[PDB]
Amino acid sequence: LLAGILLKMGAYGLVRINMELLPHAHSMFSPWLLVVGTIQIIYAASTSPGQRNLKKRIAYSSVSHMGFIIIGISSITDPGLNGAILQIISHGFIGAALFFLAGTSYDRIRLVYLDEMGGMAISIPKIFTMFTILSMASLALPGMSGFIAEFIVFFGIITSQKYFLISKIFIIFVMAIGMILTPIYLLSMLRQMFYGYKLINIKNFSFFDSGPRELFLSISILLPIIGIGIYPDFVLSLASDKVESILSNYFY
Amino acid sequence: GLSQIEPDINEDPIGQFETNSIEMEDFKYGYYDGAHTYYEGEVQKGTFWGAIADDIAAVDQTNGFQGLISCMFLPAIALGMYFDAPGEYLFIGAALFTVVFCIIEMDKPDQPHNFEPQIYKLERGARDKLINDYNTMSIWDFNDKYGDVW
Amino acid sequence: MEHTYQYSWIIPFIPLPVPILLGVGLLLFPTATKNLRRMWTFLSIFLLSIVMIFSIYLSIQQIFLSCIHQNVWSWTINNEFSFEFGYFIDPLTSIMSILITTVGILVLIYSDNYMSHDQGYLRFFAYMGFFNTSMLGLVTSSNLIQVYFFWELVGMCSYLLIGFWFTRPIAANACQKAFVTNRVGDFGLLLGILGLYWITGSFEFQDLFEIFNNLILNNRVNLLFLTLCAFLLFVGPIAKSAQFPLHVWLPDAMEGPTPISALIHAATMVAAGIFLVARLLPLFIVIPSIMYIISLIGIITVLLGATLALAQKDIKRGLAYSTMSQLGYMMLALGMGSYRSALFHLITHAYSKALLFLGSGSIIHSMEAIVGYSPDKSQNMILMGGLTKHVPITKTAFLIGTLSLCGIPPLACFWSKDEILNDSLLFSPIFAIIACSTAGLTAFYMFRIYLLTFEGHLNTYFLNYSGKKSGSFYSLSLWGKEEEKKLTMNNTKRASFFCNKTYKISNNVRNQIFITVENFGLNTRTFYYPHESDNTILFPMLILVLFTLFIGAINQEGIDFDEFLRNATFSVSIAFFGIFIAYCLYKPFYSSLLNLTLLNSFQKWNSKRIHWEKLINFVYNWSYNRGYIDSFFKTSLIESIRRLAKQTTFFDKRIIDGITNGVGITSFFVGEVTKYI
Amino acid sequence: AVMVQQIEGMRDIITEKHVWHLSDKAIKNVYMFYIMFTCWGCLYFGSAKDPFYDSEEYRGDGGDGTGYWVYETVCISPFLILLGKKEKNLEMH
Amino acid sequence: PPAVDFAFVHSVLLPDGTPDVHWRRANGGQKLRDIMLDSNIELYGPYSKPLSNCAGVGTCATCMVEIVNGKELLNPRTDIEKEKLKRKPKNWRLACQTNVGNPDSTGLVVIQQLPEWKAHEWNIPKNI
Ligand code: FES
Helix, strand or coil: CCCCCCCCCCCCHHHHCCCCCCHHHHHHHHHHHHHHHHHHHHHHHHHHHHCCECHHHHHHHHHHHHHHHHHHHHCCCHHHHHHHHHHHHHHHHHHHHHHHHHHHHHHHHCCCECCCCCCCCCCCHHHHHHHHHHHHHHCCCCCCHHHHHHHHHHHHHHCCCCCCHHHHHHHHHHHHCHHHHHHHHHHHHHHHHCCCCCCCCCCCCCCCCCCHHHHHHHHHHHHHHHHHHHCHHHCCCCCHHHHHHHHHHHHC | CCCCCCCCCCCCCCCCCCCCCCCCCCCCCCCCCCCCCCCCCCCCCCCCCCCHHHHHHHCCCCCCHHHHHHHHHHHHHHCCCCCCCCCHHHHHHHHHHHHHHHHHCCCCCCCHHHCCHHHCCCCCCCCCCCCCCCCCCCCCCCCCCCCCCC | CCCCCCCCCCCCCCCCHHHHHHHCCCCCCHHHHHHCCCHHHHHHHHHHHHHHHHHHHHHHHHHHCCCEEECCECCCCCCCCCCCCCCEECHHHHHHHHHHHHHHHHHHHHHHHHCCCCCCCHHHHHHHHHHHHHHHHHHCCCCHHHHHHHHHHHHHHHHHHHCCCCCCHHHHHHHHHHHHHHHHHHHHHHHHHHHHHHHCCCCCHHHHHHHCCCHHHCCCCCHHHHHHHHHHHHHHHHHHCCCCCCCCCCCCHHHCCHHHHHHCCCCHHHHHHHHHHHHHHHHCCCCCCHHHHHHHHHHHHCCCCCCCCCCCCEHHHHHHHHHHHHHHHHHHHHHCCCHHHHHHHHHHHHHHHHHHHHHHHHHHHHHHHHHCCCHHHHCECCCCCCCCCCCHHHHHHHHHHHHHHHCCCCCCCCHHHHHHHHHHCCCCCHHHHHHHHHHHHHHHHHHHHHHHHCCCCCCCCCCCCCHHHHHHHCCCCCCCCCCCCCCCCECCCCCCCCCCCCCCCCCCCCCCCCCECCCCCCCCCCCCCCCCCCHHHHHHHHHHHHHHHHHHHCCCCHHHHCCCHHHHHHHHHHHHHHHHHHHHHHCCCCCCCCCHHHHHHHHHHCCCCCCHHHHHHHHHHHHHHHHHHHHHHHHHCHHHHHHHHHHHHHHHHHHCHHHHHHHHHHHHHHHHHHHCC | CCCCECCCCCCCECCCCECCCCCHHHHHHHHHHHHHHHHHHHHHHHHCCCCHHHCCCHHHHCCCCCCCHHHHHHHHHHHHHHHHHHHHHHCCC | CCEECCCCCCCCCCCCCCCCCCCCCCECCCCHHHHHHHCCCCCCCHHHCHHHCCCCCCCCCCCEEEEECCCCCCCCCCCCHHHHCCCCCCCEEECCCCCCCCCCCCECCEEEECCCCCCCCCCCCCCC
């Protein structure tokens, strides 16, 4: 919930008390918040391979995925802000379940850094598959809510009336380098912590797998991600009308 | 884990990025990765119902009634639509189910994995919170090793 | 036509049942569903057969009536979105649907026994069913949204399938690379389809084909921006079809199973990179400079696909580089605008190289009984040696496949490449003679692949090399009761106990007494020979042989659906030349149809091996360093990103967390100072 | 729904365009059913035999449920052996 | 003339069960691959086909030969032999990267060709 819902106040706040309370000043500040978010995605996706730790990797992952919300907020569009709210909810589910699985993986393995903690997929296969599916959801992979979020924000950029093509090209380019760098750190985490074989861990450990409670946690946070990836209007439809009530304050 | 002695520092911090797996020189293919294991002949029967109910029975703390209501709850909400449309009845019944489940989950067994880590010394079966209402046993101070063997 | 296309929304989602039931089965009740080990297999094959039947009927209705059905629905309706997920059933879709369904069914039948000795075996079919669903949704795709959707889902299934054996770290590096490469391609695909929504505001194929015919006559759209957007839109196909920049994922994708080496490429997924270009040709021929770009990428990666496979000691990597060459041939054919010859080349290649990969897997599982399980042994083409004697059906299958790649005219598929070169040689001088040279090289390395495996002695039980086989055979000596009671522990027999003494030299005997202790015989004396694989591995190979023999005769139906003998004999001359250069080297002397008087003069003219000691050296260096492109990327692209990551986390932890922590350090310090002053 | 579209290049297109939506109420109802499923699972699987956090592996060594129990344990058991060592030296090793 | 005395024990034992020693005379030290190829003894084995080996540079691990009684006149391992083979009994050198010395050289190096696909272990006396 520090990443699930506590990180979203501040993103939601930039919508309430900044976007519809101070609109003519947001029209001055959002051009720079855009550059900040575009640099934020790359910065927080390049720091994450720098982290040997497992949990700090996902913390920086959250710093990276908040960049799309910053961008959708600074996108003076209906698609941009709808993608920001959708990414609030999507990354809520994703980061919540990812930190949950990293904590349970630390409790099972009692190792933190990715230099140690080699192949643990045969030890904890349920945790392996849930972590892989939620890394795919963090990856903006279609069939998950992260894709439609990190695509509707792009679409709000390219359909923006505030910005011009000389800037839209640079912004989209620096945004979509983020989705090259995000595979790098997420699948680096996966191949470091799960893919491999450690000869000293053969049978004498025989760690316990994901119990039914933890499996229900991960699955229960997964099913809205899948359901929103296959039908996004579980999240757009509750906000989009209100988003127009925001943007009606911006165009005139 | 335990590490009663201090562990040995590894003189080879293998790398910031590459995984901690063994090299392909020492990798016995087939047997490790399971690409040539699973010779059918050591497998067992239990075709999909003798191993589902076995797994449900493997992980369950549900008694006859608590558990029956668990099996009949989600079918009740699934028939809350496509058979009728009650409305607030569904939520009132779901709250009733949650509260009666929580009252039932004040289980007569206490299962000492529920208790604090400091309790695990030995002989904890003689401790019986299961029957003794108003236990009155000042052992949760956790600053001195009292002899609670009486 | 009236109602059968209303049910065109199922051909993606008919397989999806069994991966859905496996992902909730293997994840929640793994014992129970793995108890149904073989039933999910037949269920997957049956559902893929339903989709095969439906796609065959759709192809029949496509060739009957000339129309395209676009049964779009509405995904989301909030603002400019108005998203759809419809199915653009055109001739190209129908081709891709049959090409996916047939090869997927046959590869599933293949994996029924290839993976029967696999511990995690049902998750393989979960991945395969999801892969087939994802590709069937990719090709049945009305807008770039759904194309993109299933593009990245294909990347996901490629990652999972390549890292299917997650335990071996080489597969981990393979799958991480594959997904990173596919996403370097999908980067381009995303900021190309968004550039198309800028230039057109379309997110559909019905409108794009009706806009781009007249869009380039306007003034606001910059032609530089259009070619930039088109190149970025092609970068996706560059990655999926393994073209020159993003080709590194394919020869390293062999670390997974062989069935996926038949389905990932020579099949659905690399066919997707060709499908997208074939579908966007109506808006690539109009843009001026993108077509030359596609032709140049294809003609660079037909020789990077060819000069790489000349000396790959592995079977699957050589076939993968051959696939990388044939996909470049297809991208060249699209670069020539030949909308039909590229797809016929794709069909014959995906029914020939898939056959070759299934034959390679049967070769491999024949070889595991020899050398155990080791891809440096059980896939090492050199010590495959001779398998014509042992595995004849697989021999005929692999022979028909390789001869289909070389372009043999009567009993194989030359006519695809015939149309390729016929539409290519009167276009440009650069992209014609080098294409023919790479065709000759294709004949050479493919027949080398065939000859090093099948024709000859076994090279692993060979009694000139394998001393274990010799020690197992000669269970008794050649003297009976004489010369010994048996001898093990033979000493340094430098004089052979023949009363021989040395002349003026450095030394003859010394304190070096080394007992060359030999092994024993009459122990594990069986050493079985490679027997043929099971019948469910042969049946896919037989059906694919029937295909690539039936495809070789396909009054033409290139117009209905979508220097003749001089060019033919010239192409057959260069192909037979490559065949002959492979034959005179790799075919042994006791089985070659050539005359011994010529075969001896071959080595007599080349007994020096000095001009060949540089050519062979450079070709092997090329094939072993992988063109040095993998080394360049792993020195300047992923190591560059790793240096940048260490630099950025330094900047974060030291000198922007340094300020945040220096606030507190300075507060502590001023507190202690103003406490003590 | 059915539209025939002429295009110069390739062929004709027979677009169908079933514009639909789940609807405002059904979206609320699937939110309802999923929250009820979350209730059911939170209670039932919460009342399941969590095999890891019950045994002497987790609950034995420390097992409070924190993330610092490992580090404070391996920082305390050095202190406990040092204290037992001082007690041993108190009575002549 | 300065003649280095090679032996070149084959890996396959004879049908008698005894190894075969061939005693190639080739003069000087340039490269053991070029010596075994000029003097026509089996170095590669199944990699003896043209493109099945790197043909001298050292990029493959194919021309590896177990050399015993060869601490006298060799070049040391050139970090390609130390890397392209990593876990071997350390008597195994690549013939095209190793070098038996200079023209003015005499010695009795015995080099078991094809150490892979062999039955014997050679029981080298323990060093030092
Ligand atoms: S021949 Fe390649 S290593 Fe000597």
